[PDB]
Design a protein around this nucleic acid. Structure first.
Lengths: 158, 129, 204, 203, 106
RNA sequence: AAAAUGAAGACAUUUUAACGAGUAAGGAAACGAAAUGGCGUAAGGACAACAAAAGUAGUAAAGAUUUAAAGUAAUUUAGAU
RNA sequence: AUAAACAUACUUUGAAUCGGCCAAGUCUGGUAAGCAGGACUGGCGAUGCGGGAUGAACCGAACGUCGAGAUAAAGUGCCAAA
RNA sequence: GGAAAACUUAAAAGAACUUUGGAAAAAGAGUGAAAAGAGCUUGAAAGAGUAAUAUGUGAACGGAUAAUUUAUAAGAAAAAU
């Protein structure tokens, strides 16, 4: 599966990717939106606090039936959750993208999560047995996750 | 000399309800419904293609440059309009290769025939070349 | 050009609806309006007749939720704003921008009490009314329906009159002395060349 | 003979048909675009066929008011009409207005009731030859680039003749000072104050 | 420096109860209260001058104008009809227009 | 509709005059002054560089996505990927 | 008297349709009905446009794409042109 | 009673060694004309994700007219006697 975007300078970027990951797309789509643009060190700390329910992931688009929380103040979103499984899956991709950067020879402290994208994947079907002799579907919602870490520098064009 | 070309309506006669449904394309179709809002020419929705929009006979099918389009395929088709270079402009067909396009473009300069695809399929000679 | 100035209309001795019609037309012509003393405007009919009209207005109220329903403002400045809003386009940017240029105040506040006041001859009560037709001031009707600040405006207006009574008395003394000094200059022997031009065109 | 639709052009070692002539017997013809004729130059004193009829109020010596263009609001003295262009030749005496000799179409001026009594004005020059002489022309097309300084230069050379022709102003300046308050009237800008409606204004 | 124009208010387009014709604009000239004072302004020049905040890297002018002429009166109250090179934008309703003193006939 | 001209021009000729709403429904093809005019899909028979190498195509086909142009419209044409 | 040659007379072949509804200086049954049924004509159906705030039928007027003008019904305090 | 399911490439040359990971995999590297990477020719629409741009009070979309911004886009000749 190809990447949504290519780095501006491949010499100063690192990539990680996962395909058909067995994690919910709607939860991971909100976790990736939270960590997009922050430094790699901060993004690793934020995802660890989501795990122990100390920073919230604001559910901005998929907020149907989600409850309100005290950590959702100032984010322009009244709803949030702490998706642990999607935080752990992104953490394994963030790590893999850092040893890829270390192998290249980039300063890890200067990296940032420039591009992270979540895509839908083919669902797996199961059986749920309903009343009056019916059978419904019990479908997973896997996803693809891309990740590009690029170094940061000041931009000036005269 | 070039006459003033007048277009009575520069918009597109989009099909009714094409802006609301993705199955209904934008190519025009006459609304034949008994209760249709457009074919009854209600106020607001009263725009149908009529012969009254027809452009002037003098400047019909005239290109903005003031000439007419003559599709060409090789160097011999240019000879069909060499005697009317003030009326027709060459137009190399979309499937003609880049090699034959050089001969058509080169020959049209000799016969003073204007070509409207003179910048098509040019080789990599844009940057540093 | 641009009209950065404010047209101040003294709503004293005027009719509520005829003032509103003229203002609502000019608000659409880009003018900026302030209607001071929007409580001294007059309406046709005695107080008993006006109160019956108010009761009919007060009846209009959303049954299932009165907080959604019509809001019946009692302040005379809000009585005029309701009248002017009804004569402006509804639910478009043109009518919202026009209403942003209008203000009444129940008296003459700090900036508008020393501005030049205007009158609408079409809306003057002395022109459009039979003298024996009983009228009601918007302030008197406002108090009868629950406007709490009727005597605050009266107190503030009483101070304003007594301050303007001595400003006008002082300014009159200056103008009388200036007019005399102008008469000595006009009759002065050395100013004959200038005065001759003034008299020839009727300015002296 | 060459058909009227045939204009052969030289082929730079390109492949040519059997019928097309070779380069050794093809002469390139210059592209011709201009096909109309410029206006004929006639006698200096004869008036052009396109001579605009002047208004009755505009007479030599009348004081005008310019209500459009660069010198809008200024007051000028009308000398005569440019018979080769139909425009008015006006001197807003430079010693007073700061408006030089110029040509202005009569639709941009207002004729006032005042007068300056033009006489012994010495109008030997001040004609179509003079105004063309002092015109600041553009930098042509193929004449190098001549950026920036070119416009500045012409004004330097044309200044000595523009100044000289203001010998016309010597009579009108003296006659302006004779009338009291006329000198101040001519220098000041014309303005519409409060209450002056153009449909009620008589000048 | 000086004032050589009269403020005319862009009242609106020539219209009916429910239609509107933007080819003709209705102006209310200042000081003209009747149709009998209108004949002076028939044929005069009118400009809608407006300001655009251009960018520094753009060569477009900061001040633009649309020119037109007064062609006919509209009613018995000094409102006139004007035709412009390009129809006036209806976001300029209530704005002021400059009525010049040319083409002069005095 | 009437005059005029008419082996090929061309835009289905030139001029003049009158006329143009529309559900159901009708107006197949061909018919030089044409007894309505056309667009699109697929397959079959021909034609397609006139001097003995004769439509386009690995110097990039069909298809896909958009950008512009022609047409009242059905649609067509070309550029870029 | 007036009009009428793209007048007039048609011939053949064939489609769709024969649930209709409205108005009224009309009528019958009914207490009456936005009821039932008729005579003459104009309409809506099949019809948009300007007006009557809104409206199948009222009033003006019937429609190729447009520009400029005089208008029709009806209007001229504001919404809304006057 | 009774289906669905065709296509890598010319050739498997079907990645093969290193780092991260429990593994699956990823990142390099490499084969190939080209990843065409085995869920393999092209790859539409519905549905999503990212990037750029723009707008905002109880629907949204459309049309006429302008304004703003963006894009396209018109030239090398040439006076009087």
């Amino acid at each position: 599966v190809k990447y949504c975007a290519k780095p501006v300078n491949v010499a100063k970027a690192a990539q990680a990717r996962g395909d058909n990951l067995k994690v919910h797309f709607k939860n991971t789509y909100e976790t990736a939106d939270a960590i997009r643009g922050m430094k790699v060190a901060r993004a690793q700390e934020f995802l660890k606090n989501v795990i122990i329910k100390k920073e919230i992931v604001p559910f901005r688009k998929h907020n149907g039936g989600v409850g309100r929380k005290a950590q959702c103040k100032g984010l322009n979103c009244a709803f949030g959750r702490w998706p642990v499984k999607s935080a752990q899956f992104i953490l394994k991709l963030l790590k893999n993208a850092v040893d890829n950067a270390k192998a290249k020879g980039l300063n890890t402290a200067l990296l940032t999560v420039s591009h992270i994208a979540v895509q839908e994947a083919r669902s797996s079907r199961r059986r749920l047995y309903r009343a009056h002799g019916s059978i419904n579907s019990f479908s997973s919602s896997p996803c693809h996750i891309e990740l590009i870490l690029t170094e940061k520098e000041k931009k000036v064009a005269k | 000399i070039k006459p003033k070309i007048v277009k009575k309506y520069t918009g597109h006669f989009k099909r009714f309800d094409s802006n609301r449904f993705l199955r209904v394309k934008a190519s025009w179709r006459v609304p034949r419904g008994i209760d249709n809002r457009l074919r009854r020419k209600f106020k607001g929705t009263n725009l149908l293609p009529k012969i009254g929009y027809g452009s002037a006979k003098a400047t019909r099918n005239m290109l903005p440059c003031g000439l007419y389009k003559f599709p060409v395929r090789n160097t011999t088709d240019l000879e069909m309009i060499m005697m009317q270079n003030r009326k027709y402009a060459a137009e190399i067909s979309h499937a003609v290769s880049a090699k034959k396009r050089q001969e058509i473009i080169q020959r049209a300069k000799i016969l003073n025939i204007r070509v409207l695809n003179a910048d098509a399929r040019i080789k990599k000679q844009e940057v540093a070349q | 050009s641009t009209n950065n100035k404010v047209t101040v209309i003294d709503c004293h001795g005027h009719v509520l609806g005829r003032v509103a019609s003229v203002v609502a037309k000019h608000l659409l012509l880009g003018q900026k309006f302030v209607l001071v003393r929007c409580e001294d405007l007059q309406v046709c009919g005695t107080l008993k007749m006006r109160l019956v009209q108010w009761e009919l207005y007060q009846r209009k109220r959303v049954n299932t939720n009165p907080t959604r329903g019509a809001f019946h403002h009692r302040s005379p400045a809000d009585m005029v704003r309701k009248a002017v809003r009804g004569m402006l386009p509804k639910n478009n940017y043109r009518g919202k921008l026009a209403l942003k240029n209008l203000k009444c105040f129940e008296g003459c506040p700090a900036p508008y009490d020393k501005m030049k006041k205007s009158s609408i001859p079409e809306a003057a009560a002395i022109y459009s009314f039979n003298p024996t037709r009983k009228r009601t001031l918007l302030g008197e009707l406002g108090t009868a329906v629950g406007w709490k600040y009727a005597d605050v405006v009266a107190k503030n207006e009483a101070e304003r009159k007594e301050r303007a009574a001595k400003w006008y008395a002082a300014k009159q003394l200056k103008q009388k002395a200036v007019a005399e000094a102008k008469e000595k200059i006009l009759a002065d022997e050395k100013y004959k060349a200038k005065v001759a031009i003034l008299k020839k065109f009727g300015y002296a | 003979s060459a058909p009227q639709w045939f204009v052969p052009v030289k082929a730079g070692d390109a492949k040519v048909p059997a019928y097309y002539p070779t380069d050794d017997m093809i002469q390139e013809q210059k592209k011709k675009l201009r096909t109309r004729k410029g206006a004929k130059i006639t006698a200096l004193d004869k008036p052009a066929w396109n001579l605009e009829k002047l208004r009755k109020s505009i007479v030599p010596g009348a004081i005008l008011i310019i209500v459009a263009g660069k010198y809008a609001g200024k007051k000028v003295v009308f000398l005569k009409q440019c018979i080769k262009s139909g425009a008015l030749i006006v001197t807003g005496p430079f010693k007073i207005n700061g408006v030089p000799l110029m040509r202005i179409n009569q639709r941009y001026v207002i004729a006032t009731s005042q007068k300056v009594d033009v006489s012994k004005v010495d109008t030997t020059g001040v004609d179509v030859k003079f105004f063309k002489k002092i015109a600041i022309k553009k930098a042509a097309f193929g004449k190098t680039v001549e950026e920036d300084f070119a416009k500045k230069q012409y004004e330097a050379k044309k200044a000595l003749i523009v100044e000289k022709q203001k010998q016309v102003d010597e009579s009108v300046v003296a006659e302006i000072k004779k009338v009291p308050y006329l000198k101040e009237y001519m220098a000041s800008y014309f303005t519409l104050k409060n209450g002056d409606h153009p449909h009620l204004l008589k000048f | 420096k000086c004032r050589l124009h009269v403020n005319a208010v862009f009242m609106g387009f020539q219209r009916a109860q429910r239609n509107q014709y933007p080819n003709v604009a209705l102006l209310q000239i200042s000081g003209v209260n009747t149709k009998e004072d209108t004949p002076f302004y028939i044929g005069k020049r009118v400009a809608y001058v407006y300001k655009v905040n251009v960018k520094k890297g753009s060569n477009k002018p900061a001040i633009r104008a649309i020119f037109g002429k007064i062609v006919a009166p509209h009613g018995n109250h000094g409102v006139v009809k004007a035709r412009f090179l390009h129809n006036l934008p209806p976001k300029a309703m209530g704005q002021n227009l400059k009525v010049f003193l040319y083409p002069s006939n005095i």
